[PDB]
Amino acid sequence: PHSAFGDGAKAYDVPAFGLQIHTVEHGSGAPIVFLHGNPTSSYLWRHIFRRLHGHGRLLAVDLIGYGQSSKPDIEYTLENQQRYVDAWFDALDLRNVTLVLQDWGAAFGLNWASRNPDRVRAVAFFEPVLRNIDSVDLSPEFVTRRAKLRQPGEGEIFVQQENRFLTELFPWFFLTPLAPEDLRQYQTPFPTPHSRKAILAGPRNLPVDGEPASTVAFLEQAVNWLNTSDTPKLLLTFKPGFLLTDAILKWSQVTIRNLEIEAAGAGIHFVQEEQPETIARLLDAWLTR
């Protein structure tokens, strides 16, 4: 794996339903699992991952559709993606698990936890896909683009043929511009139109103003576990942030149980690139508690 993951980090592929889930690991102890979202991979966690050496067994995955994991010719429904995540957790048979989740990784991580409450120690998340979002609360340029992407054909042209999600939209939504070399690393998984399939499914699956209704329903499944589990939970917030809208922040304070919330400073969305030091520090103090 990449040197930025730190000394003594190894990688390997985890088989699932015929495919491969690429996995970066370091250390030993209680498992700490890092799940990315769209359109990133384990690489997004590298600086946080390295700064967290020795808290336990660090596990960062590339979801199916991303990174060095297989890119099959499936529909990237939430049900299908969840199956592969469930599979990876099965292969590794983990317990006493701390989840550290961001974007879609929050949706899949929380969904897993909710059905596996006995295997979960703690969960930290930020910029999560968590709840229905009000379009008035999101950057309008993203909302408009998403609306275009939900149109048959136009979405595939923008994301898969022209590759503009990766060449335009992705690097725009960084507070601190992303270094050339790092943008190239995020693009290496995606040489072809077909390789980019999961990238388009993301925004189409994202719940905005109630649509799609299947995603509202999928995300609702973890709500009981969130509201009633005693598992310690940590939400980091960012100014201005992106997916964590005030209404969803207020929802989480009002609905989620045993939730600590800490400001982690200036950041938009890919906050692991924006405040890796602050995040790593806040997590480290948290895991110690």
The residues carrying an active-site annotation are 103, 127, 269
Pairing of strands 97-103, 57-61: unpaired
Using CA atoms, how far apart are residues 246 and 241, in angstroms rounded to an integer? Answer: 10
Closest-CA residue to 42 (of 28, 57, 71, 63): 63
Closest-CA residue to 201 (of 80, 84, 21, 75): 75
Closest-CA residue to 14 (of 97, 86, 119): 86
Closest-CA residue to 283 (of 239, 233, 226, 218): 233
Using the CB atoms, write b or e for 249-259: b if 16+ within 10 Å.
eeebeeebeeb
Contacts of 139 (CB under 8 A, 6+ apart): 173, 242
Closest-CA residue to 130 (of 102, 150, 88): 102
CA 117 to the chain's CA centroid:
20
Closest-CA residue to 68 (of 41, 92, 48): 41
